[PDB]
Homo-oligomer: A and B are copies of this chain.
């Protein structure tokens, strides 16, 4: 999980900016993800019966970003 908020921001950035690669994979059960723009805020998850769960996952991430002056240069992933 990576979570970023900038509720306010002043940026002067003549730049390479927000570059995001390979953000990994999420498996979720009954999970709530919430961002909405007497006051009551409620998210209710309950009375859940779970039986035996077996998970076997093989994940290989190969992420390559190049800014390169390269002679005979070999990159192996």
Contacts and interface: CB of A to CB of B under 8 A. Distances in A.
Nearest to A3: B3
Interface residues of A, number: 77
A43 to B, nearest CB: 5
Contacts of A57: 55-59
Interface of A (DSSP majority class): strand
Interface string A14-56: 1111111111111111111111111111111111111111111
Contacts of A24: 22-26, 59
A6 B5 CA distance: 6
A13 B14 CA distance: 5
Given A24-B25, A58-B58, A47 B46 contact: yes
